[PDB]
Amino acid sequence: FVDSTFYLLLDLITFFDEYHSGHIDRAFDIIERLKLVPLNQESVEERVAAFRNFSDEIRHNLSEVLLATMNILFTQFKRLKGIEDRDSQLRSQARTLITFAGMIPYRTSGDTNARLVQME
Amino acid sequence: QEALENAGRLIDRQLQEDRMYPDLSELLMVSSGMDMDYPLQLLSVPNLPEISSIRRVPLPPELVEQFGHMQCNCMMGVFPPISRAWLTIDSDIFMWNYEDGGDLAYFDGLSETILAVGLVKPKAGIFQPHVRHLLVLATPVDIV
């Protein structure tokens, strides 16, 4: 258990290194790997069920996990210029993430200013 | 007598037993009638249920958007090795990451309608033997 949290913290850190310094695409891939945040469907709630269970160390970290996601998600999905462009994904991801954030704002520091980054 | 040799012998014997396990299908098994544990209801077999549905992923709207206009022909499928899904509308083809969904690739190469697509292994000895997989695409006129 102790080691597991350890690796998670390291993974999150590598995500940080690559978050900024560009590499928007890479950040999503890694964050998803964490298996902390709902990329799939409305499984956002399962992410609720598995949230309280979370160890104290991680439970604290989630705030940044979200908003990192809505950032890369934003910047990467800068509306492009002028073909296959599936904007839909990396869009659904924000949606699931927001539902997630919506469900646990009380158990979070109190910055659903995801909204600012969310829109434009 | 030595425990170490003893233990090794036990595991080996068991391993042998595991390997010997009966063949999956035999006519004799259900010659009269099949034993079935069959419920119509989901999760009807509470403890036993062989499969569960972990998740549902919708086709990304970004992908769908470039499928909006299709006069002639539609088709889609999953490539087993790739862990990617493909959609064909008319001439164009999309491949999208199963795990991601945001990540999608598009073929602009094809001029004409795409009759069929398939994933195949490369030949033993050609210039591209190295590549893991080949994508065959057939249109009315050509196979690429």
What is the C-alpha to C-alpha distance for residues A100 and A73, in angstroms, rounded to an integer? 15
What is the C-alpha to C-alpha distance for residues B140 and B143, in angstroms, rounded to an integer? 8
Task: Calculate the CA dihedral of residues B70, B73, B77, B79 and round it to 10 degrees.
Answer: -90
Rounded to a whole number, what is the distance in Å from the CA of B62 to chain A's nearest CA?
3
What is the C-alpha to C-alpha distance for residues A120 and B28, in angstroms, rounded to an integer? 68
Structure tokens at B31: 């010659």
Give chain B's length.
144
What is the C-alpha to C-alpha distance for residues A87 and B64, in angstroms, rounded to an integer? 9
Nearest alpha-carbon partner for A95 in A54, A41, A58: A41
Which helix (H) or strand (E) covers residue B14, if one does? helix B3-20
Give Cα separations from A107 to A64, A102, A110, A117, B48 (angstroms).
Answer: 14, 10, 8, 20, 37
Q: Which positions in chain A touch B57 (Cβ < 8 Å)?
A: 40-41
Residue with tokens 């597991």: A4
Give the max Cα distance, chain B. Answer: 79
Rounded to a whole number, what is the distance in Å from the CA of A70 to chain B's nearest CA?
14
> What is the chain B residue with the closest CA to A28?
B100
CA B50-B53-B59 angle, to 5 degrees, is 145
Outline where B21-135 has alpha helix (H).
61-65
Residue with tokens 């893991």: B132
Record the resolution, in angstroms.
21.4
Q: Could you tell me how far CA A37 lies from the centroid of its own chain?
A: 6
Q: Which positions in chain B touch A85 (Cβ < 8 Å)?
A: 62, 65-66, 104, 106
Q: Is B2 exposed, middle or buried (0-12, 13-18, 19+ CB in 10 A)?
A: exposed
Q: For residue A81, count other CB atoms closer than 10 A to its CB.
A: 4
Q: Is B8 exposed, middle or buried (0-12, 13-18, 19+ CB in 10 A)?
A: exposed
What is the C-alpha to C-alpha distance for residues A38 and A99, in angstroms, rounded to an integer? 10
Please answer yes or no on whether B66 and A93 come within 8 Å at the CB atom.
no
Structure tokens at B57: 């992923």
What is the C-alpha to C-alpha distance for residues B38 and B122, in angstroms, rounded to an integer? 42
Nearest alpha-carbon partner for B98 in B116, B81, B123: B81
The answer to whether the CB of A29 falls within 8 A of the CB of B100 is: yes
The answer to whether the CB of B66 falls within 8 A of the CB of A85 is: yes
DSSP B27: G
Residue A73, SS3 per DSSP:
helix
Which helix (H) or strand (E) covers residue A74, if one does? helix A56-76
Q: In sequence order, what are the beta bridge partners of B115?
A: none
Please answer yes or no on whether A86 and B104 come within 8 Å at the CB atom.
yes
Nearest alpha-carbon partner for A73 in A108, A29, A112: A29
Nearest alpha-carbon partner for A50 in A64, A36, A60: A36
